[PDB]
């Protein structure tokens, strides 16, 4: 049984459940808000925000560690230049979920995931 566990299976295997969250975390830091379903955006939370808590403290080795996390030369430079210092005071929580109803062809309960900073 599932007692005291963690994680979510999300009806995909585990060569899929890192290769999807790479693209989702490669789009969220790019556009700062996206529209995706609610279990895929309640648990994209702790995949994107420790990637920013790591990027708070700039080094040389973290430019390889987050390169391992993301594999995008654009996103490592933007994550360490812009989105690093802009949240350099909070104790985490760089995300916010906003429910946006349902979806057309499948009744998929969507959500809007965002950073706190757009204004």
């Amino acid at each position: 049984m599932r007692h005291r566990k963690s994680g979510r299976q999300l009806n995909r295997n585990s060569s899929h459940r890192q290769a999807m969250f790479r693209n989702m975390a490669g789009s969220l830091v790019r556009h700062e808000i996206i529209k995706t379903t609610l279990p895929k955006a309640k648990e994209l939370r702790r995949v994107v925000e420790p990637l920013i808590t790591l990027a708070k403290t700039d080094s040389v080795a973290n430019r390889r560690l987050a390169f391992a996390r993301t594999r995008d030369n654009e996103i490592v430079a933007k994550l360490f230049n812009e989105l690093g210092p802009r949240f350099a005071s909070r104790a985490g929580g760089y995300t916010r979920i906003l429910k946006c109803g349902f979806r057309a062809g499948d009744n998929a309960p969507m959500a809007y995931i965002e950073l706190v900073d757009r204004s």
């Binding site: 808000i33 906003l98 429910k99 946006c100 109803g101 809007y112 965002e114």
Partner: protein, 54 residues
């Protein structure tokens, strides 16, 4: 896994009794744009508790 009689409309309704879909109990209202959006959900406009997101 084969039936032996044809049952009736009475038993069909007696099974179909518990299909009682209820609607939304009540909606809820904004405070800067004023529509009846769902409870804990954004508007079609893009409002949630004062903010205009997009």
């Amino acid at each position: 896994a084969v039936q032996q009689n044809k049952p009736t409309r009475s038993k069909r309704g007696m099974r179909r009794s518990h299909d009682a879909l209820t609607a939304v109990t009540s909606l809820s209202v904004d405070k800067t744009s004023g529509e009846k959006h769902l409870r804990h959900h954004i508007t079609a406009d893009g409002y949630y508790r004062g903010r205009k997101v997009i």
